[PDB]
Amino acid sequence: MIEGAAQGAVAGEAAGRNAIIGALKRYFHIDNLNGTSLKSFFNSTSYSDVTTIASAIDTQMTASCDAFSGKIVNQAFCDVRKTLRIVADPGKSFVKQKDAITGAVTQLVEKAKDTA
Amino acid sequence: TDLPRPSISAEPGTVIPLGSHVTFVCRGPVGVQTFRLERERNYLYSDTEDVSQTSPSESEARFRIDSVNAGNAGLFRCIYYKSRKWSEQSDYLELVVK
Ligand SMILES: *[C@@H]1O[C@H](CO)[C@@H](O[C@@H]2O[C@H](CO)[C@@H](O[C@@H]3O[C@H](CO)[C@@H](O)[C@H](O)[C@@H]3O)[C@H](O)[C@H]2NC(C)=O)[C@H](O)[C@H]1NC(C)=O
């Protein structure tokens, strides 16, 4: 009785973490965030905390898709800048990366909970 | 349309010995808000807002690699943002590391 409410509660938390992790992996083609695995990343921060995840993804994108670093192992992650119209297009106004990431993460968390 | 094309140069040159330094200098008109240094791909870039107005009509931004490796080799180009529009990109510059 008491320990099935326990296994039930962690089964639900696992399915939520799994939903957001799959969504971030499939959309950003990333397996790690902020120096740790996405499963390890979601032990400390909430599964629907759009602001924290978007800021961490922004910081990682600026750090791993730069002109200085040389060879970028993960091109697909940087390629997301083209999806979010973040790459410079002559004649048009600036699109901030953090804001586009925030909108994307918003859709992804809504989609994961929509699974729920 | 009214924005002039930026130019890209490398100092001390396009051929850098392995381990040595190189600096890409992006030049545009006065009032550049942001310079963006792009690689062969649009999504691989570095931005800077420390733009120094050298002359009443020419401003520049510098992107410096202290120690190049083989992965730094390849194409680079400049683009700048001014008056709510990105300018057209400069021509590509090939960095050769030996
Ligand atoms: C993202 O990576 C950073 C590290 O680069 C992690 O930041 C650190 O997170 C811990 C909480 O897990 C913060 O709390 C504690 O701070 C006290 C001082 O108040 C210190 O005594 C503890 O040892 C621990 O550091 C810490 O301040 C924080 N530091 C920074 C620079 O952010 C962060 O947790 C990572 N985020 C995720 C979701 O993994």
Author numbering:
A (entry chain D): 191 to 306
B (entry chain C): 108 to 205
Show the paper's wording.
RIFIN, a large family of Plasmodium variant surface antigens, plays a crucial role in malaria pathogenesis by mediating immune suppression through activation of inhibitory receptors such as LAIR1, and antibodies with LAIR1 inserts have been identified that bind infected erythrocytes through RIFIN. RIFIN also mediates immune suppression through activation of inhibitory immune receptors including leukocyte-associated immunoglobulin-like receptor 1 (LAIR1) and leukocyte immunoglobulin-like receptor B1 (LILRB1). Notably, human monoclonal antibodies that contain LAIR1-domain insertions in either switch region or between V and DJ regions have been isolated from donors, who have had malaria. To define the structural basis underpinning interactions between wild-type and antibody-inserted LAIR1 and polymorphic RIFIN, we investigated the overall architecture of three types of LAIR1-inserted antibodies, determined crystal structures of LAIR1 in complex with the RIFIN-interactive regions from two RIFINs (PF3D7_1040300 and PF3D7_0401300), and used the resultant structural information to derive a LAIR1-binding signature and to identify RIFINS from diverse Plasmodium species capable of recognizing LAIR1.
Phylogenetic analysis of the RIFIN-V2 apex sequence revealed two additional 3D7 RIFINs, referred to as RIF3 (PF3D7_0401300) and RIF4 (PF3D7_0401200), to be in the same branch as the initially identified LAIR1-positive RIFINs (RIF1 and RIF2). A similar approach also identified seven RIFINs in non-3D7 strains. Co-immunoprecipitation (co-IP) assays confirmed LAIR1 interaction with the newly identified 3D7 RIFINs, RIF3 and RIF4, and with three of the non-3D7 RIFINs. To provide insight into the recognition of these RIFINs, we determined the structure of the RIF3-V2 domain in complex with MGD21 LAIR1 at 2.5 Å resolution. The RIF3-LAIR1 structure resembled that of RIF1-LAIR1 with an overall rmsd of 1.46 Å over 546 Cα atoms, despite clear diversity in the primary RIFIN sequences at the binding interface. Structural analysis and sequence comparison of the LAIR1-RIFIN complex suggested a set of four conserved residues contributing to LAIR1-binding capacity, including residues D247, C254, C265 and R268. The interface between RIFIN-V2 apex and LAIR1 C-C’ region largely comprises hydrophobic interactions and backbone-mediated hydrogen bonds, and the interface is facilitated by an induced conformational fit of flexible RIFIN-V2 apex loops.
